């Protein structure tokens, strides 16, 4: 309800939505719900950087009045247009119609499209242009794909304050603001829960990013997200963090994900983590209709090597399984690789599916073929599997 | 627990399972449990026809004795070798080892797969063949891919009885055990969920075995499948089903099933319906995260037409339509119409995923490149999806 200062004149007004339990609708859980966080640079002029999700516009006007009522609003930053950052963009114009929006061509297009009847003074930002509020000045980053095209991160020279908007968040609802009010571990994995399932097919992008910000050599100070806690403590073991996603160098761990009917599958998933271990790989297992999706993702992160298995149900996979490899095919995994296993009872199926998927998600199979059984398994098919565990093993080596 | 007579020697003596909620592993929900029937037919000699699921061994040998206390068993009928039915067969073989075994050729390697370490004597069976009990006698007819290629149902022509093991079953638990002591409506409403996600691929062999029945003309007075109850007042009711919904002819609805993020592919789902609807076609509509992928598909075995819609996320389809299309694809649904439909940020990529998916299950599509909307739809986007359900309506016609 009240606004929290980041340091005086620089407010967060943002909102806190703690029963959210699923983000973009069914892709992201939230199992602690997120924020949608807002900032108020008070100066000569004032300027308000992204909005909120247009539920919670009641308590961004609220905690606005609460820094000046009649809001002023000189300037209104759009970072980026998704729905949870810009929905309160029509009450927030229709309370101050003055307001001078700063984006992106791209960003300006995507709001004339979700608003269209809505006219607003504005000016097209580029990386580099900079506005001055009077004591403190804004400047801009552009950063396509760094989620959306039209993505950019806004920075204050004056506090070496970066607001990347969506880059660098969490999706964590807390009555505390920032990073050194919270546990180190856990928000780091929040962080990596994050990453792994939207900004992991921008690696590439994300190690330009981090570079071109290296090069001119920007002072970050503090880092403030449109999502979760404000990195002002320690900016620098995030941005390390990113770094080392990004890179994709990985861990000497394997994440095998898999389902089955009658237990089969599940004696030959086991079998290929009895290898993987022995080789001395640490392995996470998910029978993928008990597990989440997205917990799965966030461990293939790190990973090194993923396997998954499925039995061949009416000539296909299992339905289960699908949602993790399609959601692979789409996240691109960078350096990974893979291997395919399951089993049948007369023709197959699943393995041919599964092993075209893994490739259409450039994951590299340690094997053409990979384990196959059928009905169930004997000594040999287990003992088979556990040796290609221990191929695995090898290779994601260390 | 104790057994249920059927008729004077003949007797249920299977197992209830109250708790189960999925079966197969993930791929059907039981949101009431099933059952594992059952039968030991008594006479000179004595037979039991199927066994039951492992776990429940327990109560089938609790069952037999109270019969006749040390367990006789002469013949041991196995109508079908998957888990549910022949997890039993160690515990069974080892109180009888001198047990009989009548069963199909494909039965017989299937039982040698899953237990060998078991020898038993026994008699490859083939349409037509018929043992002799005494008073009465069992038949056999060959029912290859009527679920598995070992398939096969019995016959006991002296109470025209048929036991088809799993066709003309439904997953129910109940303490009583006839279709006469249970609601119409909802006993048929089971039987075609279950047919739906079981038996939809074979429609064409459903009608030929059907057929193949009706020649030979077969009197049957009384259905015990091998799950839930026994058609002993009106075994035409179910047979008749089983021959419309394998003809396959369907009914003037249309089923609807998407996800969205931000409503745009919702919108349009509504559009849609409003098209169908108006044009005099019932349409059941399914958000998919959160409604149930067989009660979906159940819907789609009597609609006539399909409508599958998703935004795209990643060049990708939303995980959670994955599901649905790789079971489609699967169940080759026969005699449908279709088409995909779904909003876009810029790149777009859902819709071709869709399209493939939906082909691959041999759904013709009223409409290549259907409905696509960038961000948000414009009132002549929501008209032209509106006289696309209108086109659709008019094919469903009826
Ligand atoms: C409904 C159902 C459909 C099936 N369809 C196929 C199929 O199309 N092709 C095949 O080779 N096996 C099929 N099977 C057999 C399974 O692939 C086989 O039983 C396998 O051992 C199960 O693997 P699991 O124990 O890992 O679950 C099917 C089994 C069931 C229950
Ligand atoms: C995490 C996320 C990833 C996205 N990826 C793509 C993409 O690869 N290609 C595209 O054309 N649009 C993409 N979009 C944009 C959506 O397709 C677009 O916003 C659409 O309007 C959402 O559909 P809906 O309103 O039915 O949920 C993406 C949006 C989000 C939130
Ligand atoms: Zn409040
Ligand atoms: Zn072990
Ligand atoms: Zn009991
Ligand atoms: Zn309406």
Same mark, same amino acid.
């Given at each position: 309800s009240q606004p929290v200062a980041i340091?005086?004149? /620089?407010? %967060?007004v943002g909102a806190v939505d703690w029963? /959210? +339990?699923?983000?973009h609708g069914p892709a992201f859980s939230t199992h602690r719900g997120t924020t949608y966080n807002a900032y108020l640079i008070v100066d000569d002029k004032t300027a308000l950087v992204d909005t909120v999700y247009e539920p919670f516009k009641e308590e961004l006007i609220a905690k606005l009045k609460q820094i $000046?009522?009649? @809001?002023?609003?000189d300037y209104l930053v759009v970072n980026h247009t998704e729905?949870?950052? #810009? =929905? #309160?963009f029509p009450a927030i114009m229709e309370l101050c119609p003055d307001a001078h929006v700063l984006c992106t061509q791209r960003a300006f297009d995507s709001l004339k499209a979700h608003y269209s009847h809505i006219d607003f003074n504005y000016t097209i930002v580029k990386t580099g242009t900079s506005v001055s509020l009077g004591k403190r000045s804004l400047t801009f980053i552009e950063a396509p794909m760094?989620? %959306?095209?039209?993505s950019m991160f806004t920075y204050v020279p004056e506090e070496a304050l970066?607001?990347?908007?969506?880059?660098?968040? &969490?999706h964590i609802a807390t009555s505390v603001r920032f990073?050194? &009010?919270?546990?180190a571990g856990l928000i780091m994995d929040e962080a990596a829960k994050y990453y792994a399932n939207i900004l992991m097919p921008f690696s590439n992008l994300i190690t330009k990013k981090l570079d071109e910000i290296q090069k001119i050599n920007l002072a970050i100070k503090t880092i403030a997200p449109?999502? =979760?806690?404000? %990195? +002002? $403590?320690?900016?620098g073991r995030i941005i390390e963090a990113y770094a080392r996603w990004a890179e994709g &160098?990985? $861990?000497?761990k394997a994440v095998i994900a898999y389902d089955t009917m009658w237990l089969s599958t599940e004696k030959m998933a086991h079998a290929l983590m009895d290898g993987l271990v022995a080789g001395g790989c640490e392995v996470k297992l998910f029978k993928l209709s008990v597990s989440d999706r997205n917990d799965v993702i966030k461990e293939i992160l790190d990973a090194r090597a993923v396997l998954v298995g499925s039995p061949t149900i009416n000539n296909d996979?299992?339905? @289960?399984?699908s949602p993790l490899l399609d959601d692979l095919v789409g996240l691109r995994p960078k350096n990974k690789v893979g291997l395919a296993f399951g089993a049948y009872g %007369?023709? =197959?199926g699943a393995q041919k599916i599964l092993e075209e998927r893994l490739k259409a998600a450039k994951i590299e199979l340690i #094997?053409?073929?990979?384990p196959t059984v059928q009905w169930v398994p004997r000594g040999e098919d287990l003992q088979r599997c556990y040796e290609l565990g221990r191929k695995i093993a090898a290779r994601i080596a260390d």
């Open positions: 340091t005086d004149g /620089i407010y %967060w029963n /959210i +339990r699923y983000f $000046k009522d009649p @809001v002023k609003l729905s949870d950052h #810009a =929905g #309160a760094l989620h %959306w095209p039209d970066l607001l990347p908007n969506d880059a660098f968040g &969490q990073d050194d &009010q919270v546990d449109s999502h =979760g806690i404000i %990195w +002002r $403590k320690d900016p &160098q990985g $861990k000497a996979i299992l339905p @289960v399984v %007369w023709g =197959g #094997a053409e073929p990979g």
